[PDB]
Design an enzyme around this catalytic site. Structure first.
Site, PDB file in Angstrom:
ATOM      1  N   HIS A 133      30.050  43.587  36.713  1.00  0.00           N
ATOM      2  CA  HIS A 133      29.974  43.389  35.476  1.00  0.00           C
ATOM      3  C   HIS A 133      28.371  44.449  35.151  1.00  0.00           C
ATOM      4  O   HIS A 133      28.321  44.138  33.545  1.00  0.00           O
ATOM      5  CB  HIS A 133      29.035  41.876  35.567  1.00  0.00           C
TER       6      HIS A 133
ATOM      7  N   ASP B  73      41.061  44.680  38.262  1.00  0.00           N
ATOM      8  CA  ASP B  73      40.064  43.333  39.244  1.00  0.00           C
ATOM      9  C   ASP B  73      40.858  42.009  39.118  1.00  0.00           C
ATOM     10  O   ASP B  73      41.417  41.924  38.111  1.00  0.00           O
ATOM     11  CB  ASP B  73      39.147  43.699  37.386  1.00  0.00           C
TER      12      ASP B  73
ATOM     13  N   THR C 194      38.729  55.609  25.967  1.00  0.00           N
ATOM     14  CA  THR C 194      39.645  56.611  26.704  1.00  0.00           C
ATOM     15  C   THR C 194      40.580  56.292  27.720  1.00  0.00           C
ATOM     16  O   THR C 194      40.806  55.329  27.849  1.00  0.00           O
ATOM     17  CB  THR C 194      38.177  57.982  28.029  1.00  0.00           C
TER      18      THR C 194
ATOM     19  N   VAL D  36      40.698  56.118  32.169  1.00  0.00           N
ATOM     20  CA  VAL D  36      40.805  55.864  32.700  1.00  0.00           C
ATOM     21  C   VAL D  36      41.481  53.870  32.140  1.00  0.00           C
ATOM     22  O   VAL D  36      41.178  53.752  31.220  1.00  0.00           O
ATOM     23  CB  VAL D  36      39.257  54.867  32.748  1.00  0.00           C
TER      24      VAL D  36
ATOM     25  N   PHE E 241      42.694  40.357  35.883  1.00  0.00           N
ATOM     26  CA  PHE E 241      42.907  38.715  35.571  1.00  0.00           C
ATOM     27  C   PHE E 241      41.953  38.322  36.270  1.00  0.00           C
ATOM     28  O   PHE E 241      41.156  38.343  36.967  1.00  0.00           O
ATOM     29  CB  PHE E 241      44.144  39.275  36.556  1.00  0.00           C
TER      30      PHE E 241
ATOM     31  N   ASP F 238      36.301  34.916  44.439  1.00  0.00           N
ATOM     32  CA  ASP F 238      35.543  33.952  43.958  1.00  0.00           C
ATOM     33  C   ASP F 238      36.576  33.499  42.643  1.00  0.00           C
ATOM     34  O   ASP F 238      36.760  32.652  42.305  1.00  0.00           O
ATOM     35  CB  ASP F 238      34.298  34.506  42.929  1.00  0.00           C
TER      36      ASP F 238
HETATM   37 NA    NA Z   1      38.791  40.065  36.909  1.00  0.00          NA
HETATM   38 NA    NA Z   2      40.302  53.008  28.761  1.00  0.00          NA
HETATM   39 ZN   LIG Z   3      32.970  37.149  39.430  1.00  0.00          ZN
END
Ligand code: NA
Ligand code: NA
Ligand SMILES: [Zn+2]
Lengths: 372, 9
Positions: free
Chosen positions: A139, A172, A188, A191, A196, A262
């Site tokens: 984050h 993620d 870009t 990457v 999800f 989590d």
């Molecule tokens: Na995620």
């Molecule tokens: Na990207």
């Molecule tokens: Zn989280």
């Protein structure tokens, strides 16, 4: 080569990571990393992987993405001088969700150090996989903290991989949207970020299906919005096909997998209904593609399940089967009343209908078709 | 992230 065989795993851990305290009542407990480490040691997994102690990432290494003004604030702010920085605390989003605590910058150094050292170990081709459960703070923004994250170790570790890898894939599976990593590489095509997450009246409020990137990075940002109560079967029905389609179209040379716990059933902050096996299924799916893989931590706020999840996912990376009976450890009482490794899902309703999961997946394949 | 009352958090 054919794409198989047991992979070499390098594991990063600092014994001091479990002493940093966010404050009374705060759900982020760095003690969960010490529980995870102590649990896999009693399983004997230290015999199958190399265990490294990460260095403390300097302010110079952090400024490869973060601004000088934001990093210098992190080195300076302390619980005893918060009054002088009350303006800077609001500017950098520090004080409430991301509080000031003793050793805040050192905790960022240890979390970042394990991620960048793993990326270096992968660039030098000295390992197949690198594990840093203290990382995955997805984050943190360029000049502000967010969602318990201060320094975005993922962005710094991916910038390290970009020195030798033309295309890097970020996955993620945290229940929250990986906004910080997505924002950093939004413009870009070097990457691709695949997240999800639960979407709709949920932190951080980003990650819509229609967010696909901008500029040269258009169609290189993938987001799967989900509802409450998704289980292992519904999650596994879409993860493997979408990840497989991303590997075919994007063809990365390195993969980063944020394994936020989590999204497990019974999480203090999460509302999914995944088990450890359903969560770890994502690891072994990414693992089958036989690409240099950096596994990072992240969310997870029912710490007894966090220790279960990351211990089993370490064994999955090692291709080592461990028994469901938990061995004795320094936190054996935390795992009552069952003292088992694997968890069972709750009876909560899965608001993700099978047709909804199929429709969101079908619209994501449309976007993936726009790649060269 | 932690709590409710707007903005998620
Ligand atoms: Na995620
Ligand atoms: Na990207
Ligand atoms: Zn989280």
């Amino acid at each position: 080569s054919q794409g198989g065989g047991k992979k070499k795993v390098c594991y990063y851990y600092d014994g001091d990571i479990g002493n940093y305290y966010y404050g009374q009542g705060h759900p982020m407990k760095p003690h969960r990393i010490r529980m995870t480490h102590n649990l896999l040691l009693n399983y004997g997994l230290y015999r199958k992987m190399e265990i490294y102690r990460p260095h403390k990432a300097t302010a110079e290494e952090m400024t490869k993405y973060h601004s000088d003004e934001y990093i210098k604030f992190l080195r300076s702010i302390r619980p005893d001088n918060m009054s002088e920085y009350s303006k800077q605390m609001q500017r950098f989003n520090v004080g409430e969700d991301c509080p000031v605590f003793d050793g805040l910058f050192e905790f960022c150094q240890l979390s970042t150090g394990g991620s960048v050292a793993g990326a270096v170990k992968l660039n030098r081709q000295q390992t197949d996989m690198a594990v840093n459960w203290a990382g995955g703070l997805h984050h943190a923004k360029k000049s502000e903290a967010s969602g318990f994250c201060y320094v975005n170790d993922i962005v710094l570790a991916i910038l390290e991989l970009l020195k030798y890898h033309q295309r890097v894939l970020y996955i993620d599976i945290d229940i929250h949207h990986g906004d910080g990593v997505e924002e950093a590489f939004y413009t870009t095509d070097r990457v691709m970020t695949v997240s999800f997450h639960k979407y709709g009246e949920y932190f951080p409020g980003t990650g819509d299906l229609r967010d696909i990137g901008a500029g040269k990075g258009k169609y290189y940002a993938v987001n799967f919005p989900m509802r409450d109560g998704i289980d292992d079967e519904s999650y596994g029905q879409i993860f493997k096909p979408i990840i497989s389609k991303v590997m075919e179209m994007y063809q990365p040379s390195a993969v980063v997998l944020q394994c936020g716990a989590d999204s497990l059933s019974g999480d203090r902050l999460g509302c999914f209904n995944l088990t450890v096996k359903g969560h770890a299924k994502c690891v072994e799916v990414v693992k089958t593609f036989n690409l240099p893989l950096l596994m990072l931590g992240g969310g997870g706020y029912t710490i007894r399940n966090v220790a279960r999840c990351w211990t089993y996912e370490t064994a999955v990376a090692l291709d080592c089967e461990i028994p469901n009976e938990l061995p004795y450890n320094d936190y054996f009482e935390y795992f009552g009343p069952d003292f088992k490794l694997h968890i069972s899902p709750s009876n909560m309703t899965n608001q993700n209908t099978p047709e909804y999961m199929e429709k969101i997946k079908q619209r994501l394949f449309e976007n993936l078709r726009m790649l060269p | 992230x932690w709590x409710d009352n707007x903005x998620x958090k």
